[PDB]
Subunit: 63 residues, 6 copies
C-alpha cells in the first residue's frame, strides 16, 4: 500500500464559505435538537458495530 | 495498491458557497430535530453493522 | 505501508470562512440541544463498538 | 476573472426610508426652486463640457 | 482575479433613514433655492470642463 | 488577486439616520440658498477644469 509521487486528498473539506447579512432569527426548543450553523465534519475512518459517526440534530429516544 | 504519479481526491467537499441576505427566520421545536444551516460531511470509510453514518435531522424513537 | 514522495492530506478542514453582519438572534432552550455556530471536526480514525464520533446537537434520552 | 456569489454595485442607491407622522407643512414661492421631497439619483457616467448633472433646486440666470 | 462571496460597491448610497413625528414647517421664498428634503446622489464618474455635478440648492447668476 | 468574503467600498455613504420629534421650523429667503435637509453624495471620480462637484448651498455671482 504505497504512493510513489502524488497528491492524495482523502476526507477533506475546504472553501466552505458562508456569508450572512441582516439575518434575524428566533428559536425555541423543548427537549429536541436544533442545529442552525456551519458544520464541517471530515473523517477518514469509523469502525465499530452499532456506531453513529458524524450525527447532527440526532434525537435518540430509546426503550 | 499503489498510485505512481497522480492527483487522488476521495471523499472531499469544496467551494460550498452559501450567501444569505435579509433572511428572517422563526423556528419552534418540541422533541424532534430541526437542521437549518450549512453542513459538510466528508468521509472516506464507515465500517460496522447497524451503523448510522452522516445522519442529519434523525429522530430515532425505538422500542 | 509507505509514501515515497508525495503530499498526503487526510481528514483535514480549511478555508472555512464564515462572515456575519447585523445578525440579530434569540434562542430559548429547555432540556434539549441547540448548536448555532461554526464547528470543524477533523478526525482520522475512531474505533470501537457503540461509539459516537463527532456528534453535534445530540439529544440522547435512553431507557 | 470569475465572480462566484458576488454582488457588484457601481453607482446605485438603495434602502432609503422616510417615515413621517402628523407632519404639517406650508410653502410659498416666487420664481425660485423649492425641493421638499425625496430624491435618489444614481448615474454611472456623465460627460460633456459645461455639463450639469444631478442638479436639485438649481437656479440659473444672466 | 476571482471574487467569491464578495461585495463591491463603488459609488453607492444606502441604508439611509429619516424618521419624523409631529413636525411643523413653514417656508417662504423669493427667487432662490430651498432644499428641505432627503437627497441621495451616487455618481461613479463625471467629466467635463467647468462641470457642475451633484449640485443642491445652487444659485448661479451674472 | 482574489477576494474571498471581502467587502470593498470605494466612495460610498451608508447607515445614516436622522430622527426628529416635535420639531418646529420656519424659513424666509431672498435670492440665496438654504439647505435644511439630509444630503448624501457619493462620487467615485470627478474631473475637469474649474469644476464644481458636490456643491450644497452654493451661490455664484459676478
Amino acid at each position: 500500500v504505497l504512493y510513489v509521487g502524488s497528491k492524495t486528498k482523502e476526507g477533506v473539506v475546504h472553501d466552505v464559505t458562508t456569508v450572512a447579512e441582516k439575518t434575524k432569527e428566533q428559536v425555541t426548543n423543548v427537549g429536541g435538537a436544533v442545529v442552525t450553523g456551519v458544520t464541517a465534519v471530515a473523517q477518514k475512518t469509523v469502525e465499530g458495530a452499532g456506531s453513529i459517526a458524524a450525527a447532527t440534530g440526532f434525537v435518540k429516544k430509546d426503550q
